[PDB]
């Protein structure tokens, strides 16, 4: 589906409607320093590694909308529930 790059709507921070800019959430890079990372290293050994021997699941036919809404004036973003969309394209 199509969607405006910018549009007026409620900013939960200013607590008042203002122009926002929609953008897809780019994945952040991991640091390999979280507790789970330490448990992986520490708990993996000889033979099967339990949960750490498992491998990546799969994919649902269509994914949900993963967007960031940025307030045009206070510059802060907020998140919203997403909706299944095979494809999402912005307008302008």
């Amino acid at each position: 589906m199509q969607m405006p790059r910018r549009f007026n709507t409620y900013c939960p921070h200013c607590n008042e409607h203002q122009e926002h800019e929609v953008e897809k959430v780019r994945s952040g890079r991991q640091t390999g320093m979280k507790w789970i990372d330490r448990q992986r290293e520490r708990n993996s050994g000889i033979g099967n590694d339990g949960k750490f021997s498992k491998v990546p699941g799969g994919d649902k036919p269509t994914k949900k909308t993963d967007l960031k809404y940025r307030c045009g004036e206070c510059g802060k973003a907020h998140l919203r529930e997403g909706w299944r969309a095979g494809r999402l394209e912005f307008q302008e």
């Binding site: 050994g45 000889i46 033979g47 099967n48």
Partner: protein, 194 residues
Amino acid sequence: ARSAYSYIRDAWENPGDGQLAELQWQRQQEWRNEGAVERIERPTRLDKARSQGYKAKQGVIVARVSVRKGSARKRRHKAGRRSKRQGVTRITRRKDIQRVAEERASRTFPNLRVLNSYSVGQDGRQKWHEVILIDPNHPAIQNDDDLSWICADDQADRVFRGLTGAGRRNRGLSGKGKGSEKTRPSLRSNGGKA
């Protein structure tokens, strides 16, 4: 002033440098041709030996023991085992090489008792340790106030029961506080969990 001994010690802080380096390069050639347990007239590291209880006296013996380097020499399982227990290559023994050396020496001298031991180097495939043993039955020692304790009946086969210094550190008894919950008073009384 500095004791002459401090020079032997000081040299062994870096067995790979200077004169000691060239000495080792030479000795190991002969050591590699000696047995598994060779009695020697004099400690290769006087300061260390004396520091551990050595004494130029009747009933005091020293022996260099050679032991292979590396992990456990283990046979792969011949029956059912869950993956966790199918290992062979990465398994290491819980007794350190120095302790293995101390035992081989004591067995060689059935009548003697291990007093202590220290390392004298290694090449690419074996480690050498010199073990100090004592004759608990020689009056020279029985009358020595600094050693006669090792004469007592309860010190018999002390090495095989981990009463050696190396045996006690290996048993995780160094710390008197945090971390030694399952080591002191013994590994066995704590259900073998250390």
